[PDB]
């Protein structure tokens, strides 16, 4: 059977199960989590895990609204900060350390992310944070070092392009791409409590990008994944989740290097976005549903669950004692790129954690981003369009 097989046929003998609706639609993540849950459900006692793969995280924040609305709600599911926000209005999730979930060890950056008055409301589950993807050899090509800082990428980039003929910093029209340069160029989306769209720093993150383009260094990426574009055109370097580097690894035709984000300046590296996801329990959940998730979530912050999930994903271990686990040691010891995976995860920034942020960060923010990128709207324009349009829903 494939594990989702193993896990129906698990699930059909239980007397309890609790459903945990996630948004993994394949891959490493996708065999990571049920690969999890089949190893919990042979622990228990007839009380299962059942995943149910809802499509991507935008899919499974729409599936979860509806479930409100039909007065019915899975046992756990995944959830950004920003969802955990929304979901708190409806008074939806059970506080995780009153279910008994010992949070001890875990990432104080991941902790805080979902801690709501102080409060603790998710387990931090599937964290990325962005890296530097890079082509090992057309770097080695051309003699060009791993950039380290802002002015060494771009530079870099204008070389590269210039020897190959073709854009070599291939990057998504996204929010996430955008956070990248803004938070590197100083910038914060809240002043004073007051989300701002339109700042100083995202007009030059913004315009960096659009003339980046322009000026032939970099490649926007309209249809699929960076990893699902590679083999068109020369590559040199990516700023990508690390959750993306089994799908790098098995695209790359060159040998694929990771770095720490190019910085302000040598001192530290940049600042990467932190994205992925939490798991979140409904007060829906009957007491048995409660008592599976509790243990459930207690095995996945386990040291070897942590070390198998993040090593097979790419994804950083949340608890100090994975990186402790011997599992986790012998696969470090043999592949530097998660080392430099954990290494970045220092370096770490989040988007606001509105509950309006979902909508804001893709139909907004990112059409602002796409209008400058593909259609060489005015990134001002572009961004006071963003920004009044967030008002308007921020004030609804
Ligand atoms: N709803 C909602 N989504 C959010 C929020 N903040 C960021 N994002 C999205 O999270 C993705 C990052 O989350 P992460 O778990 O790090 O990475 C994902 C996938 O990105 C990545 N993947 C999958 C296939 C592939 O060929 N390559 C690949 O890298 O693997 C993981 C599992 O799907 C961004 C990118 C996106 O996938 O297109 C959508 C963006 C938020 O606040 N809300
Ligand atoms: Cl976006």
Redesign the pocket.
Known sequence: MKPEDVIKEQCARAKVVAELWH???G?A?KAALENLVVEFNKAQQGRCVRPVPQG???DL?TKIKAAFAAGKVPTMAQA?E??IALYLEAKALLPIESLGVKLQGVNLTFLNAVRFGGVVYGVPF?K?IQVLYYNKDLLKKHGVPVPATLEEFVAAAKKLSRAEGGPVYWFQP?A?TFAYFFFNLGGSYLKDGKLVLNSKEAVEALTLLQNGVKEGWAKPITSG?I??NLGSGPYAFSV?????YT?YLRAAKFDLGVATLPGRTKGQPGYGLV???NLVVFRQASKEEQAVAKDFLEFVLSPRAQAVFATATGYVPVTEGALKDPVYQAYAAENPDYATIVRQSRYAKF?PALAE??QI?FDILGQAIKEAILNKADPKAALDRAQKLAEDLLSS
């Open positions: 948004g993994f639609t891959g993540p991507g995280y935008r924040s950004a920003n969802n599937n990325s996204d996430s994944y990893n699902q990508d989740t690390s959750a993306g799908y994205q992925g996801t988007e942020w979902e960060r």
